[PDB]
């Protein structure tokens, strides 16, 4: 059945995870009570990828909700589809993690992880052919970043031949909780380079700009940013939740998207940017989707080259005109694709559009311009660490300056690796 186990950790991880289940449950006919009231069986054909069946033939998300304080979880429970979720699958502690990676990864997190892995284990064993795991979390806080990457290390240990995929939100000064965010995020990126197969870099800087100078919102809330994440997460998983010529699964996606095992951080993209009754034409989907202004990761992709790309158009449109329009923008912009990976841009079409759009296009890009992101964090990181500032919050939890130097070092390698393929 190739089931996926979804895990959402921390504040940012549980709010975007909560929106994800809202969006795709509507796409699959499942109402807030877990009952299915849809019209096509395309909705139910591949529905066991993300849902377990119930006794009343209801549907329950294969979702585990993890936090080190309950504040967000009871709010998820009180929110829209909150009662869709398996009540045992709420795993949480009380002390919080203080926007502190060490507390999530080493002290408070370690106290809670085994109970999390018991739910993982329970959810995993029911699966006929589990493909792997999908984690939603931010990297700038403490639970989603520190505990999140701890969970990933343990899962890799228990399930080393399953696929680990994450949706990982990147801190940005423009949308910032605390100044130690670059510390937490440098530490998590080291974990993600080693222990995930595919990571989607959702940048909070990009979501803000899109929300400001495009969706024409002058002061965007987190709900505006998370609306954009809902849409990308729905689209990036369309080929997984719906049947097609493509038999897309997590392992095949990694095989075809990742030429080099460390370079597996994807820039997602979306069109049209929702926040409208004239559907976009296929040349609009194509031009917009590839515009700098439609990337969720805040790198101009004209600054580096695409190793690989995977795109889906949702709606009822000219399959051929897609191919025509794709191959156009490629051969109008062939300066930003690598000439040494034949046929590295792949396209799909799906007849089911998402709610409130007749035409949409999601884009997954493995571009070397994502080095702009890691450079950005690496600069913010060194700016503090050179004066050892704010470190006491970490050395008081056990960590040595050593562990920081290595994470700084391993991430600057990541930026070097990405740079050597920009020129080839």
């Amino acid at each position: 059945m190739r089931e996926i186990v979804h895990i959402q950790a921390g504040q940012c991880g549980n709010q975007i995870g909560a929106k994800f289940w809202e969006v795709i449950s509507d796409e699959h006919g499942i109402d807030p009570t877990g009952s299915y009231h849809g019209d096509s069986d395309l909705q139910l054909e591949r529905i066991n990828v993300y849902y377990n069946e119930a006794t009343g033939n209801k549907y329950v998300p294969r979702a585990i909700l993890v936090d080190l304080e309950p504040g967000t979880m009871d709010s998820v429970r009180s929110g829209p589809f909150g009662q869709i979720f398996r009540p045992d699958n709420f795993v949480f502690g009380q002390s919080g993690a203080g926007n502190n990676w060490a507390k999530g990864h080493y002290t408070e997190g370690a106290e809670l992880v085994d109970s999390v892995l018991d739910v993982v284990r329970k959810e995993s064993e029911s699966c006929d052919c589990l493909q792997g795991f999908q984690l939603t979390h931010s990297l700038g806080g403490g639970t989603g970043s520190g505990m999140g990457t701890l969970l990933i290390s343990k899962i890799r240990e228990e399930y080393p031949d399953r696929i680990m995929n994450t949706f990982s939100v990147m801190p940005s000064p423009k949308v910032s909780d605390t100044v130690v965010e670059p510390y937490n995020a440098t530490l998590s990126v080291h974990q993600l380079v080693e222990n995930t197969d595919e990571t989607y870099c959702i940048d909070n800087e990009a979501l803000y700009d899109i929300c400001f100078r495009t969706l024409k919102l002058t002061t965007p809330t987190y709900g505006d940013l998370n609306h954009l994440v809902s849409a990308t997460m729905s689209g990036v998983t369309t080929c997984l939740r719906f049947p097609g010529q493509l038999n897309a699964d997590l392992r095949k996606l990694a095989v075809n998207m990742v030429p080099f095992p460390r370079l597996h951080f994807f820039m997602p993209g979306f069109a049209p940017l929702t926040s409208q009754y004239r559907a976009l034409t296929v040349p609009e989907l194509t031009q917009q989707m590839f515009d700098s202004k439609n990337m969720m990761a805040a790198c101009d992709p004209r600054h580096g080259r695409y190793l690989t790309v995977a795109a889906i158009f949702r709606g009822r449109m000219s399959m051929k005109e897609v191919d025509e329009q794709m191959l156009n923008v490629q051969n109008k912009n062939s300066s930003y694709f690598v000439e040494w990976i034949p046929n590295n841009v792949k396209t799909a079409v799906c007849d089911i559009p998402p709610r409130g759009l007749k035409m949409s296009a999601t884009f997954i890009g493995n571009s070397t311009a994502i080095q702009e992101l890691f450079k950005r964090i690496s600069e913010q990181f060194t700016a503090m660490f050179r004066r050892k500032a704010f470190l006491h919050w970490y050395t008081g939890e056990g960590m040595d300056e050593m562990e920081f130097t290595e994470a700084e070092s391993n991430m600057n390698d990541l930026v070097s690796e990405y740079q050597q393929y920009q020129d080839a």
Binding site: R2, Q245, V255, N256, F260, M319
Partner: protein, 439 residues
Amino acid sequence: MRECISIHVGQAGVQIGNACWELYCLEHGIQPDGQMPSDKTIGGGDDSFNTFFSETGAGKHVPRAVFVDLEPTVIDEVRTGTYRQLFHPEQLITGKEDAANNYARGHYTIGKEIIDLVLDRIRKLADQCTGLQGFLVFHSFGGGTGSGFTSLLMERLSVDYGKKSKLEFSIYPAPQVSTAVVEPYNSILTTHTTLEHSDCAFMVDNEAIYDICRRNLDIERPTYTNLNRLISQIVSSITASLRFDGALNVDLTEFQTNLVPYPRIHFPLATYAPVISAEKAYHEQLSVAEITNACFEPANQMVKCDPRHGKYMACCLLYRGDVVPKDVNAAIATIKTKRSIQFVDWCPTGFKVGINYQPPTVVPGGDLAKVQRAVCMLSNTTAIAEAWARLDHKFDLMYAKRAFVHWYVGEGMEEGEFSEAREDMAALEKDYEEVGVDS
């Protein structure tokens, strides 16, 4: 009478299998429930169609096929489809998880654990054979199963049946209808491993068929159904000699003998005409001489290449329908002059011809129009080395950076099997040059 066992590996091999076995039933008049009214010898026989079908006491005619796929999704559709009552449940073999477009994961990792079961299921067919000839193996070059498990199966088949012929129908990979960026990798890999175990391999380039479906059936986006129903006609022409009364190409050894002098050079170029849209309102039926000239246009080959620029080693013409030899040697006579047809010096410039008077069958409702005469040409020309050159360049671009190699090594392969397989293809490209061009 001597039996032939068909083996369908992967998605491409199974779905084309379905396309062929449906056509075989329409051609020999076998109903979806296995019954064959015209067959009067109930429960046995040594007829020509018995080479492909066995018979049960209750009168059912049962394919001598085995279907294998590392995942269940596609063979499951045979399990419930219009011909569920056709096959023995034991003939449809599916695993748990597929080979994730990875040669090394279909060969080494997942492959090693279904291989003994499949051979045991094939053995139960071999045991139903009074004098088995060998095997017809259908697969993609590009899938992980299709490339990786097949070369594992072709290895053991040489071991369990060293004295049996093995024929290949191979789907070569085309971008404008494709599924993985690493198909060039799996292509080279499986070709290197499978070579010495296959006596004759018919390569179908998916771009050729796709363009043929676009140009001649006027279909904008050809489906796999469109692609496969046309591939069936060509496979039915090639196999017709084994399932029907005839004196040309009557056993698998005759395919080696007639088309394969040099054994490494065993990839005969197929050409086929006419392809005619069934929604073509008014159509002027084409002549023997017309459909034989088509056999020399690139746009009708199963692999786009320019045979004017290599040398032929053999040519076979297989007609289906209203054809007589007078019509044929006339058309040959005229084409010999006006076209560049150059054999190798150590080979006779000539054609072996065969005519089955039954005109081609079409799937009712499908996209191909019924015709009164068709032909399939099988020419062992050296211009098919263009398709190796193409594949080998695409492999060279990626492998110079080692892109995606880690996914193979991750399964137990060594980088060396990559440069060993490419060194083999570089030889095979050179052999073709030693035979096809002059200083």
